[PDB]
C-alpha cells in the first residue's frame, strides 16, 4: 500500500509546508490522481499527522476540504492540543469502541479540554454479559474517567464527598475484580491524594473549620463531622494533612496553652499530677460539673490522662492481687472474694459496660474491624467467665481442703486460670496508648502492620509442625514406655514419652524451636537402634526446616515488609493517633471505668424510657416531645451557602495550583521536539513562498 504522488502530499503536510499542501488539495478536486484520506507506512492520516504536530493552519485547510475526520478528535484529545480540538469541535479505529471523547479527555486530566467538552453537553455513564474483557475494560475506563481531578472540579458539586465515595468504591472493588487490583488501588490512592491536595489549599483557619465541620442536617454543629466521615472511609492521607493536624492538636490541648515548654520532666510532673488526681477530679464531674472542675476533665487531654491512670491503677491492683499480703488461704475451696478482688470488680463492670456502649454505636461493623476491640472483648468475656466460675464455686465448695488434694477440673482452679489469662490480656492492652506518644507511635504501627505477614507464615509453620508430628507419632507410636516414668510427659524432669501420642508430639515439636527440649527423647526402652536413628533424623529434619529455613525466611520476609511499610509509617501513624484522639473528643464516656458504673443523677429516667420501646411509649417521642416550628433551615441554608463558597475558592485554588505546578513542570519528550522542528519548517516554507 503505497504511491509516489500522495506520499509527496503527506510529506508536505509532515514537514509543515503550506503552499504544496494547498496545491495538492485544490488539484485533487479536478483530477482523481490522489486519495486525500490515505494512510502512510506507519498508520497516520494526513489529518492525524497535522494533529500530531499542532499545526492548526493545515488542520483548518484539511477541515475546510472535507477530509474524512473519522476519530481524529480522539487523537487530538490524546495529544491534549487545545487549538486543534477547538477547530474540530466547530465541525477500523485505534481506540476501544466504548471510549467517548469525554472519557478520554478525563483520562488525560487536561483542564482546557474538559472545559470545552462539558460545555457541549457531554455525559459520562455510571457503573453499578457473555464476554468479559469488554465489560471490565469499560468499567475501568469509566472509573479512571471520573477519578480525574480535572473532571471532579467541573462536575461534583461536593468534591470532598465525591473523592471519598470514589476512593471507597475503588478500594472495595479492587478485591471484587482481583485481576486489575493494581490499577484500582492506584486510582484509589490517586483520588486520596486529590482529597489531601484539595484540603491543602485552605488559607485560613476559618476556611478550615468549615470544611472539617460540615454534614447534612436533615433536621436531625461543630463536632468535626466531616473529619469523622473521613475516618470512616479510611482516608488516612486526608487526616495526616499538616494544618488539619494542627487544628486537632489545638483542640486537644484546650485546657492550657503551650505544651511546648514541656521537656523530659516538665511534662511528666504535670501528667503524673493529674494521673494521681483523677479520683476526685472524676468525682467533681460526677456530682457538680457546673463551673469548678467538672469542665476540667471534660477537656480531652485530661480525659486521656484520667483514663490511662485508671487503667494503670487497674494493673496495679492486678499485680497486687497476687501478693500474699492480701491473698486468701490457698487451702480453701471457693473462697469469698478478697478485698483486692472487691476493688477490682468495679473495673470489670466498667470495662464491660464501656464495651457494650461502644458496640451499641458501631453495630458489630467497625467493632470487629479493630483488632484491639477484639482483644478487649475476649478479655471481658474471660472476666465474665471468672466471675461466674468463682460464684458457682462459692455456692458449693465448703472449703477446708489442701490444694494438693483438689480433684482435677475444679471450678476454683479453672476460675484462677481464666483470671490469669485475662490479666495477661489486660496488661497487654495498654499498648494501644503508645499510639499517642510520638516515639512509640510509628514503631507500634509497624508492629501492627507486619503481624499479618507473621500470621500468613505461621500458618505454614503450623502445617509443617502437623506434618512432622504425624510422622513422629507414626514412628514412636508403640513404645508407650510408662512403667517407671513418673509424671509422664514432655514437661518432666527427664523429658520422657515426648513422642508417644499426638498431643505430646505436637507439644514437643513446639518446644524444640526454642531449644527447651533435649535429645534422648528419641531414645526408646530397647536396642532398636534403627528406629532411634530414623526418629532422630526426622527430628533433625524438623529442626533444620524450622530454625534454619523457616525462621530465617520469616526474618527475610519481614525485612522487606518493613522496607515497604516505612514509606507510609508516618501518615498511617498520624491516622491511628487521630483515631485515638477523636475517641476522647466527644462528651460520651468521659468517666473512667472505676467511676463509670456509678449511676447517673437520674439513673431511672433514661433507662426506662429507652426500655419503653416494645410498648406504646416508643411512639410517644415525636408527637409531644417536639411541637415547635423547627426553625433551623434558615441557619442551615446560610451555613451550606458559606460552605459552598469555601469549596468554590478551594477548587479554584487547586486548579490554579495544578496547572502551574504539574502541567508546566513535567519533562520534555520527543513529540515536543518534533512540534518545534515542524514550526520552524513551516516558517521556512512560508517565508520562502513570500519571496
Amino acid at each position: 500500500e503505497l504511491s509516489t504522488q500522495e506520499k509527496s502530499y503527506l510529506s508536505a503536510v509532515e514537514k509543515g509546508d503550506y503552499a504544496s499542501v494547498k496545491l495538492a488539495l485544490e488539484e485533487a478536486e479536478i483530477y482523481f490522481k490522489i486519495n486525500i484520506n490515505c494512510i502512510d507506512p506507519l498508520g497516520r492520516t494526513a489529518l492525524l499527522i497535522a494533529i500530531e504536530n499542532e499545526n492548526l493552519e493545515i488542520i483548518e485547510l484539511l477541515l475546510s476540504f472535507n477530509v474524512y475526520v473519522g476519530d481524529a478528535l480522539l487523537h487530538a484529545i490524546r495529544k491534549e492540543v487545545v487549538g486543534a480540538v477547538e477547530l474540530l469541535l466547530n465541525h477500523f479505529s485505534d481506540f476501544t469502541p466504548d471510549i467517548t471523547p469525554i472519557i478520554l479527555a478525563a483520562h488525560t486530566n487536561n483542564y482546557e479540554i474538559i472545559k470545552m467538552l462539558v460545555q457541549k453537553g457531554v455525559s459520562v455513564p455510571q457503573p453499578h454479559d457473555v464476554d468479559s474483557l469488554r465489560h471490565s475494560r469499560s468499567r475501568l475506563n469509566i472509573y479512571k474517567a471520573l477519578a480525574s481531578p480535572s473532571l471532579i472540579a467541573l462536575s461534583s458539586e461536593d468534591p470532598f464527598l465525591t473523592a471519598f465515595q470514589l476512593s471507597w468504591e475503588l478500594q472495595e472493588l479492587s478485591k471484587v475484580e482481583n485481576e486489575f487490583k493494581a490499577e484500582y488501588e492506584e486510582l484509589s490512592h490517586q483520588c486520596k491524594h486529590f482529597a489531601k491536595d484539595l484540603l491543602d489549599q485552605t488559607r485560613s483557619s476559618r476556611e478550615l473549620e468549615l470544611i472539617l465541620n460540615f454534614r447534612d442536617d436533615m433536621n436531625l454543629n461543630n463536632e468535626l463531622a466531616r473529619l469523622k466521615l473521613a475516618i470512616k472511609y479510611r482516608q488516612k492521607e486526608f487526616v495526616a494533612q499538616p494544618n488539619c493536624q494542627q487544628l486537632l492538636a489545638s483542640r486537644w490541648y484546650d485546657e492550657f496553652p503551650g505544651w511546648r515548654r514541656r521537656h523530659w520532666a516538665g511534662k511528666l510532673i504535670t501528667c503524673v499530677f493529674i494521673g494521681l488526681m483523677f479520683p476526685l477530679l472524676s468525682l467533681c464531674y460526677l456530682v457538680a460539673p457546673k463551673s469548678r472542675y467538672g469542665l476540667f476533665i471534660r477537656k480531652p487531654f485530661i480525659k486521656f490522662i484520667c483514663h490511662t491512670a485508671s487503667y494503670l491503677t487497674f494493673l496495679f491492683l492486678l499485680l497486687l492481687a497476687s501478693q500474699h499480703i492480701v491473698s486468701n488461704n490457698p487451702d480453701r475451696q471457693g473462697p469469698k472474694p478478697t478485698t483486692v478482688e472487691w476493688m477490682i470488680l468495679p473495673w470489670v463492670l466498667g470495662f464491660i459496660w464501656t464495651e457494650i456502649k461502644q458496640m451499641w454505636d458501631g453495630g458489630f461493623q467497625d467493632y470487629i474491624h479493630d483488632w484491639w476491640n477484639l482483644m478487649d472483648f475476649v478479655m471481658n468475656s474471660l472476666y465474665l467467665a471468672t466471675i461466674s466460675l468463682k460464684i458457682v464455686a462459692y455456692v458449693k465448695y465448703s472449703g477446708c481442703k489442701p490444694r494438693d488434694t483438689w480433684e482435677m477440673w475444679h471450678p476454683t482452679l479453672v476460675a484462677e486460670a481464666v483470671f490469669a489469662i485475662a490479666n495477661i490480656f489486660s496488661s497487654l492492652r495498654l499498648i494501644s496508648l503508645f499510639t499517642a506518644n510520638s516515639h512509640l507511635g510509628p514503631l507500634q504501627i509497624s508492629l501492627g502492620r507486619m503481624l499479618l505477614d507473621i500470621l500468613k507464615f505461621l500458618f505454614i509453620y503450623c502445617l509443617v509442625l502437623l506434618a512432622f508430628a504425624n510422622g513422629l507419632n507414626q514412628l514412636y507410636f508403640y513404645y508407650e514406655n510408662s512403667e517407671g516414668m513418673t509424671c509422664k510427659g514432655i514437661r518432666c524432669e527427664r523429658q520422657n514419652n515426648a513422642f508417644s501420642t499426638l498431643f505430646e508430639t505436637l507439644q514437643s515439636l513446639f518446644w524444640s524451636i526454642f531449644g527447651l527440649i533435649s535429645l534422648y527423647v528419641t531414645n526408646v526402652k530397647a536396642d532398636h537402634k534403627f528406629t532411634e536413628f530414623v526418629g532422630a533424623t526426622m527430628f533433625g529434619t524438623y529442626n533444620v526446616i524450622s530454625l534454619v529455613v523457616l525462621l530465617n525466611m520469616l526474618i527475610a520476609m519481614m525485612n522487606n515488609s518493613y522496607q515497604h511499610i516505612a514509606d507510609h509509617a508516618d501518615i498511617e501513624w498520624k491516622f491511628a493517633r487521630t483515631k485515638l484522639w477523636m475517641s476522647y473528643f466527644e462528651e460520651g464516656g468521659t468517666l473512667p471505668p472505676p467511676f463509670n458504673i456509678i449511676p447517673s443523677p437520674k439513673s431511672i429516667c433514661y433507662l426506662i424510657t429507652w426500655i419503653k420501646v416494645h410498648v406504646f411509649k416508643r411512639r410517644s417521642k415525636r408527637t409531644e416531645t417536639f411541637g415547635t416550628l423547627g426553625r433551623r433551615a434558615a441557619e442551615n441554608v446560610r451555613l451550606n451557602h458559606q460552605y459552598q463558597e469555601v469549596l468554590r475558592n478551594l477548587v479554584k485554588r487547586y486548579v490554579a495550583a495544578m496547572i502551574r505546578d504539574a502541567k508546566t513542570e513535567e519533562g520534555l519528550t520527543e513529540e515536543n521536539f518534533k512540534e518545534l522542528k515542524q514550526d520552524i519548517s513551516s516558517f521556512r516554507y512560508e517565508v520562502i513562498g513570500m519571496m
Partner: protein, 48 residues
C-alpha cells in the same frame, strides 16, 4: 404516625408567603428563609 400536631401556627394551605415573618417574629432574609419549604402535607412525613 404521630403527625399533624405542629400545625398550631397561624395559617389551611401553607405557602412561602406567610411563613417569612413567622420565623422573623421569633427569629431574625428572603433569599435563604424561602428555602425552608424548598405545596402542602410533606413536612410531617419523611421526617424519620
Amino acid at each position: 404516625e404521630e403527625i399533624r400536631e405542629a400545625f398550631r401556627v397561624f395559617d389551611g394551605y401553607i405557602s412561602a408567603a406567610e411563613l417569612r415573618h413567622v420565623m422573623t417574629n421569633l427569629g431574625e432574609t428572603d433569599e435563604e428563609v424561602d428555602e425552608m419549604i424548598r405545596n402542602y402535607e410533606e413536612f410531617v412525613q419523611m421526617m424519620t
